[PDB]
Amino acid sequence: ASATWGAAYPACENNCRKKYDLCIRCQGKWAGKRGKCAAHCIIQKNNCKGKCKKE
């Protein structure tokens, strides 16, 4: 009706969805930082949703 967007930029955000899932290196990279390997990486896919989407 009005706020009909998302299929124009999708990548812009999808990139962080993959990223979030390509960032959880709870092993090695996050050798013990597990608790945050997760949270940390999820806030990415989510921050993205505020840079590409309006909802």
Coordinates of C-alpha atoms in Angstrom, one line a residue:
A1 CA 0.0 0.0 0.0
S2 CA 2.8 2.4 0.9
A3 CA 5.9 0.8 2.6
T4 CA 6.2 -1.8 -0.1
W5 CA 10.0 -2.3 -0.4
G6 CA 12.6 -5.1 0.2
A7 CA 12.7 -6.9 -3.1
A8 CA 14.8 -4.0 -4.5
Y9 CA 17.7 -4.1 -2.1
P10 CA 17.4 -7.6 -0.6
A11 CA 21.0 -8.5 -1.0
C12 CA 21.9 -5.5 1.1
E13 CA 20.6 -7.4 4.1
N14 CA 20.8 -11.0 2.9
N15 CA 24.6 -10.4 2.8
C16 CA 24.5 -10.1 6.6
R17 CA 22.3 -13.2 6.9
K18 CA 25.0 -15.2 5.3
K19 CA 27.6 -13.1 7.1
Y20 CA 26.0 -13.8 10.5
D21 CA 26.2 -17.5 9.7
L22 CA 29.7 -17.1 8.1
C23 CA 30.8 -15.2 11.2
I24 CA 30.0 -17.7 14.0
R25 CA 33.5 -19.1 14.1
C26 CA 32.8 -20.2 17.7
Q27 CA 35.8 -22.4 17.1
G28 CA 39.4 -21.2 16.7
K29 CA 38.5 -17.5 15.9
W30 CA 36.1 -17.5 18.9
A31 CA 38.0 -20.2 21.0
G32 CA 35.9 -19.8 24.1
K33 CA 34.1 -16.7 22.9
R34 CA 31.3 -19.0 21.9
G35 CA 28.7 -17.2 24.1
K36 CA 29.2 -14.2 21.9
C37 CA 30.3 -15.9 18.6
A38 CA 26.7 -16.3 18.4
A39 CA 25.0 -13.1 19.8
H40 CA 27.7 -11.0 18.2
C41 CA 27.2 -12.4 14.7
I42 CA 23.4 -12.4 15.0
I43 CA 23.4 -8.6 15.7
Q44 CA 25.0 -8.3 12.2
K45 CA 22.1 -9.9 10.2
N46 CA 19.9 -7.7 12.5
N47 CA 21.7 -4.4 12.2
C48 CA 21.6 -4.9 8.4
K49 CA 17.8 -5.1 8.6
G50 CA 17.8 -1.4 9.8
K51 CA 20.1 -0.2 7.1
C52 CA 18.3 -1.9 4.2
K53 CA 14.7 -2.3 5.5
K54 CA 12.4 0.2 7.3
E55 CA 10.6 -2.5 9.4

